[PDB]
CSV table of C-alpha atoms and ligand atoms in Angstrom, one decimal:
chain,number,residue,atom,x,y,z
A,440,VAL,CA,15.1,7.5,19.7
A,441,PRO,CA,17.2,6.1,16.9
A,442,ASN,CA,17.0,7.7,13.5
A,443,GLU,CA,19.0,5.1,11.6
A,444,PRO,CA,17.5,4.8,8.1
A,445,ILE,CA,15.8,1.4,7.4
A,446,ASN,CA,14.5,0.2,4.1
A,447,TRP,CA,11.5,-2.0,4.4
A,448,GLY,CA,12.4,-5.4,2.8
A,449,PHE,CA,12.1,-9.1,3.4
A,450,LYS,CA,12.8,-12.5,1.8
A,451,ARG,CA,9.9,-13.1,-0.5
A,452,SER,CA,7.2,-15.6,0.4
A,453,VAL,CA,7.8,-19.3,-0.4
A,454,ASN,CA,5.5,-22.3,-0.7
A,455,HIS,CA,2.7,-19.8,-0.1
A,456,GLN,CA,3.8,-19.3,3.5
A,457,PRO,CA,3.9,-15.8,5.1
A,458,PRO,CA,7.4,-14.2,4.9
A,459,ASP,CA,9.2,-12.9,8.0
A,460,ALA,CA,11.2,-9.7,8.3
A,461,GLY,CA,13.3,-11.1,11.1
A,462,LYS,CA,13.4,-10.3,14.8
A,463,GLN,CA,14.9,-6.8,14.6
A,464,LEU,CA,12.2,-5.6,12.2
A,465,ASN,CA,9.4,-7.5,13.9
A,466,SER,CA,10.4,-6.1,17.3
A,467,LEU,CA,10.8,-2.6,16.0
A,468,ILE,CA,7.7,-2.8,13.9
A,469,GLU,CA,5.6,-4.2,16.8
A,470,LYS,CA,7.0,-1.5,19.1
A,471,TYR,CA,5.1,1.2,17.1
A,472,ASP,CA,2.1,-0.9,16.0
A,473,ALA,CA,3.2,-1.0,12.4
A,474,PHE,CA,2.7,-4.2,10.4
A,475,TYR,CA,3.3,-5.9,7.1
A,476,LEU,CA,0.8,-8.7,7.4
A,477,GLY,CA,-2.9,-9.1,8.2
A,478,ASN,CA,-4.4,-12.3,9.8
A,479,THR,CA,-2.3,-15.3,8.7
A,480,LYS,CA,-4.8,-17.7,10.3
A,481,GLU,CA,-7.1,-17.3,7.3
A,482,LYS,CA,-7.0,-17.3,3.5
A,483,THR,CA,-7.2,-13.5,3.4
A,484,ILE,CA,-5.4,-11.0,1.2
A,485,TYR,CA,-5.4,-7.2,1.4
A,486,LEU,CA,-4.8,-5.1,-1.7
A,487,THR,CA,-2.8,-1.9,-1.4
A,488,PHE,CA,-1.4,0.4,-4.1
A,489,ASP,CA,1.2,3.2,-4.1
A,490,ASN,CA,0.3,6.0,-6.5
A,491,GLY,CA,2.9,8.6,-7.4
A,492,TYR,CA,1.7,9.5,-10.9
A,493,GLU,CA,-0.8,8.4,-13.5
A,494,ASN,CA,0.2,6.4,-16.6
A,495,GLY,CA,-3.4,5.7,-17.7
A,496,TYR,CA,-4.5,2.5,-16.1
A,497,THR,CA,-5.9,3.4,-12.7
A,498,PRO,CA,-9.5,3.7,-14.1
A,499,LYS,CA,-9.3,0.2,-15.4
A,500,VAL,CA,-7.8,-0.9,-12.0
A,501,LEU,CA,-10.8,0.8,-10.3
A,502,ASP,CA,-13.3,-1.0,-12.7
A,503,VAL,CA,-11.6,-4.3,-11.9
A,504,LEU,CA,-11.9,-3.7,-8.1
A,505,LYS,CA,-15.6,-2.8,-8.6
A,506,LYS,CA,-16.2,-5.9,-10.6
A,507,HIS,CA,-14.9,-8.2,-7.9
A,508,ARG,CA,-16.3,-5.9,-5.2
A,509,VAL,CA,-12.9,-5.7,-3.5
A,510,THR,CA,-11.8,-2.7,-1.5
A,511,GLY,CA,-8.4,-1.3,-2.2
A,512,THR,CA,-6.2,1.0,-0.2
A,513,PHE,CA,-4.4,3.5,-2.3
A,514,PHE,CA,-1.4,5.4,-0.9
A,515,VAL,CA,-1.2,8.7,-2.7
A,516,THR,CA,1.4,11.4,-3.0
A,517,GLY,CA,0.8,15.2,-3.3
A,518,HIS,CA,1.5,15.3,-7.0
A,519,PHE,CA,-0.9,12.3,-7.6
A,520,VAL,CA,-3.8,14.0,-5.8
A,521,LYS,CA,-3.2,17.4,-7.5
A,522,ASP,CA,-2.8,15.7,-10.9
A,523,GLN,CA,-5.7,13.2,-10.7
A,524,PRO,CA,-8.4,14.8,-8.6
A,525,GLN,CA,-11.2,12.8,-10.3
A,526,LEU,CA,-9.4,9.5,-9.7
A,527,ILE,CA,-9.1,10.5,-6.1
A,528,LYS,CA,-12.8,11.1,-6.2
A,529,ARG,CA,-13.6,7.7,-7.7
A,530,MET,CA,-11.5,5.9,-5.1
A,531,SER,CA,-13.6,7.8,-2.5
A,532,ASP,CA,-17.0,7.4,-4.2
A,533,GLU,CA,-16.3,3.7,-4.8
A,534,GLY,CA,-15.6,2.7,-1.2
A,535,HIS,CA,-11.8,2.6,-1.4
A,536,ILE,CA,-9.4,3.8,1.2
A,537,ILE,CA,-6.9,6.6,0.6
A,538,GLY,CA,-3.6,6.2,2.4
A,539,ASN,CA,-0.8,8.7,2.8
A,540,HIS,CA,2.4,8.5,0.8
A,541,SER,CA,3.5,12.0,1.8
A,542,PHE,CA,3.1,15.2,-0.3
A,543,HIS,CA,6.5,15.4,-2.0
A,544,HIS,CA,7.5,11.8,-1.5
A,545,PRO,CA,10.7,12.7,0.4
A,546,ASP,CA,12.9,10.6,2.6
A,547,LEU,CA,11.1,11.3,5.9
A,548,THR,CA,14.2,10.3,7.9
A,549,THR,CA,15.7,13.6,6.6
A,550,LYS,CA,12.7,15.6,7.9
A,551,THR,CA,11.8,17.2,11.2
A,552,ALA,CA,8.6,16.5,13.0
A,553,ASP,CA,7.5,19.9,11.9
A,554,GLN,CA,8.2,19.0,8.3
A,555,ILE,CA,6.8,15.5,8.6
A,556,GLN,CA,3.5,16.9,10.0
A,557,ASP,CA,3.2,19.2,7.0
A,558,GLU,CA,4.3,16.5,4.5
A,559,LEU,CA,1.5,14.3,5.7
A,560,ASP,CA,-1.3,16.7,6.6
A,561,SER,CA,-1.0,18.5,3.2
A,562,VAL,CA,-2.0,15.3,1.4
A,563,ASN,CA,-5.1,15.0,3.7
A,564,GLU,CA,-5.9,18.7,3.1
A,565,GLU,CA,-6.0,18.2,-0.7
A,566,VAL,CA,-7.9,14.9,-0.5
A,567,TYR,CA,-10.5,16.5,1.7
A,568,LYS,CA,-10.8,19.5,-0.6
A,569,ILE,CA,-11.8,17.0,-3.2
A,570,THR,CA,-13.8,14.4,-1.3
A,571,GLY,CA,-15.1,16.2,1.8
A,572,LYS,CA,-14.1,13.0,3.6
A,573,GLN,CA,-11.1,11.7,5.4
A,574,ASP,CA,-10.1,8.0,5.9
A,575,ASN,CA,-8.5,6.6,9.0
A,576,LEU,CA,-4.8,7.6,9.0
A,577,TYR,CA,-2.6,5.1,7.2
A,578,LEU,CA,0.9,5.8,6.1
A,579,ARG,CA,3.4,4.1,3.8
A,580,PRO,CA,6.9,5.8,4.1
A,581,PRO,CA,8.0,7.3,0.8
A,582,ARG,CA,10.7,5.1,-0.9
A,583,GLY,CA,9.9,2.5,1.8
A,584,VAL,CA,12.5,4.2,4.0
A,585,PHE,CA,11.9,4.8,7.7
A,586,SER,CA,13.5,4.8,11.2
A,587,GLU,CA,12.4,4.5,14.8
A,588,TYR,CA,12.3,8.3,15.0
A,589,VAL,CA,10.0,8.4,11.9
A,590,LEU,CA,7.7,5.6,13.2
A,591,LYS,CA,7.5,7.1,16.6
A,592,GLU,CA,6.9,10.6,15.3
A,593,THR,CA,4.2,9.6,12.7
A,594,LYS,CA,2.5,7.5,15.3
A,595,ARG,CA,2.5,10.5,17.6
A,596,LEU,CA,0.8,12.2,14.7
A,597,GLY,CA,-2.0,9.5,14.7
A,598,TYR,CA,-0.8,7.5,11.7
A,599,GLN,CA,-0.8,3.8,11.3
A,600,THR,CA,2.2,2.7,9.3
A,601,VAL,CA,1.5,0.0,6.8
A,602,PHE,CA,4.2,-2.0,5.0
A,603,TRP,CA,3.6,-5.0,2.7
A,604,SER,CA,4.3,-8.7,2.3
A,605,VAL,CA,4.0,-9.1,-1.4
A,606,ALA,CA,5.6,-6.8,-4.1
A,607,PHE,CA,7.4,-7.2,-7.4
A,608,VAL,CA,8.7,-4.9,-10.2
A,609,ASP,CA,5.6,-3.5,-11.7
A,610,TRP,CA,6.8,0.1,-11.7
A,611,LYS,CA,9.6,0.3,-14.2
A,612,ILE,CA,8.3,2.2,-17.2
A,613,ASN,CA,11.3,1.5,-19.4
A,614,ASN,CA,10.7,-2.3,-19.0
A,615,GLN,CA,7.0,-3.1,-18.7
A,616,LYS,CA,6.9,-6.9,-18.8
A,617,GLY,CA,3.2,-7.4,-19.6
A,618,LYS,CA,0.3,-9.3,-18.0
A,619,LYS,CA,1.8,-12.7,-17.3
A,620,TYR,CA,4.8,-11.4,-15.3
A,621,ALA,CA,2.6,-9.6,-12.7
A,622,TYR,CA,-0.1,-12.3,-12.7
A,623,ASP,CA,2.4,-15.1,-11.9
A,624,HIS,CA,4.0,-13.0,-9.1
A,625,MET,CA,0.5,-12.4,-7.6
A,626,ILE,CA,-0.3,-16.1,-7.7
A,627,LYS,CA,3.1,-17.4,-6.6
A,628,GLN,CA,3.6,-15.0,-3.7
A,629,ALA,CA,0.1,-15.4,-2.3
A,630,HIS,CA,-0.1,-16.4,1.3
A,631,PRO,CA,-2.6,-16.0,4.2
A,632,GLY,CA,-2.7,-12.5,5.6
A,633,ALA,CA,-0.7,-11.2,2.7
A,634,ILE,CA,-0.6,-7.5,2.1
A,635,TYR,CA,0.0,-6.8,-1.5
A,636,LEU,CA,1.7,-3.7,-2.8
A,637,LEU,CA,0.9,-3.0,-6.4
A,638,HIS,CA,1.4,-0.1,-8.8
A,639,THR,CA,-1.1,0.9,-11.5
A,640,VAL,CA,1.3,2.3,-14.0
A,641,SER,CA,2.7,-0.8,-15.9
A,642,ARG,CA,1.2,-2.2,-19.1
A,643,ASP,CA,-1.8,-4.6,-18.3
A,644,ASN,CA,-1.4,-4.4,-14.6
A,645,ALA,CA,-5.2,-4.1,-14.6
A,646,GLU,CA,-5.9,-7.3,-16.5
A,647,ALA,CA,-3.3,-9.3,-14.5
A,648,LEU,CA,-5.0,-8.1,-11.3
A,649,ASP,CA,-8.4,-9.1,-12.7
A,650,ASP,CA,-7.3,-12.6,-13.5
A,651,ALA,CA,-5.4,-12.7,-10.2
A,652,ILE,CA,-8.4,-11.9,-8.1
A,653,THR,CA,-10.5,-14.2,-10.2
A,654,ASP,CA,-8.1,-17.1,-9.6
A,655,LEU,CA,-7.2,-16.3,-6.0
A,656,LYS,CA,-10.9,-16.3,-5.1
A,657,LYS,CA,-11.3,-19.8,-6.8
A,658,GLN,CA,-8.5,-20.9,-4.5
A,659,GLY,CA,-10.6,-19.8,-1.6
A,660,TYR,CA,-9.1,-16.4,-0.8
A,661,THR,CA,-11.1,-13.5,0.6
A,662,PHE,CA,-10.0,-10.0,-0.2
A,663,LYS,CA,-10.2,-7.5,2.7
A,664,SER,CA,-9.3,-3.9,3.3
A,665,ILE,CA,-6.8,-2.3,5.6
A,666,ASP,CA,-9.7,-0.9,7.6
A,667,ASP,CA,-11.0,-4.5,7.9
A,668,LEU,CA,-7.5,-5.7,9.0
A,669,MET,CA,-7.5,-3.0,11.7
A,670,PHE,CA,-11.1,-3.7,12.9
A,671,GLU,CA,-10.7,-7.4,13.1
A,672,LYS,CA,-7.4,-7.3,15.1
A,673,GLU,CA,-9.0,-4.8,17.5
A,674,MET,CA,-11.3,-7.5,18.7
B,678,NDG,C1,4.8,6.1,-5.9
B,678,NDG,C2,5.7,4.8,-5.8
B,678,NDG,O1,6.0,4.1,-6.8
B,678,NDG,N1,6.1,4.5,-4.6
B,678,NDG,C3,7.2,3.6,-4.4
B,678,NDG,C4,6.9,2.4,-3.4
B,678,NDG,O2,5.8,1.7,-3.9
B,678,NDG,C5,8.1,1.5,-3.3
B,678,NDG,O3,7.9,0.5,-2.3
B,678,NDG,C6,9.4,2.3,-3.0
B,678,NDG,C7,10.7,1.4,-3.3
B,678,NDG,O4,10.6,0.7,-4.5
B,678,NDG,O5,9.6,3.4,-3.9
B,678,NDG,C8,8.5,4.3,-3.8
B,678,NDG,O6,8.2,4.7,-2.5
């Protein structure tokens, strides 16, 4: 199996229509049961987050999710778990899903199955030490980089690879654009079956999310979890 590195990417959504990664990604993605979209036949959105480190807003993000009773899926790294045990515990205690973003956040395509297995299981090990629980296995490739070998291998390891359909620059600390920037992206890029990828490190990301959920719901959107996405497609 091919180990050519691939960077997950796509032309952004337009006119609130789902985006498309093209035939090559779709075919490859489908081949290993990985996806970047949920059910596009309904006004549904799935919130996911990538957490590499804490910059002080995740608690507010969690309070916001609780307020709207929405279930998030947080993809954590080894450092994040080790550094924020209590946040990992709140995510757990509050009904949220904890995804895998690898322990050291390396370029998995440069790793061996032996290494990949440790990169992933060590995150679960730490999460369990803290929660005593373990979510279904979801993986988001560190740096968004992957390959057929990586997909195949991680799938062989029982992981469901989850990409995204909505993302923007809410992770540059040296240039935190404020509430409006993120809020508008979340409104403009919204489409049915959209899988959002957000970070909780930029200034006001929590308040923009708050307003975004508030308004997206007014527009008739229902927020579902990656577990819900999985269950509903099963049937
Ligand atoms: C912890 C963190 O910020 N993860 C990011 C991920 O969200 C993003 O898609 C990728 C490319 O920008 O780089 C990292 O993997």
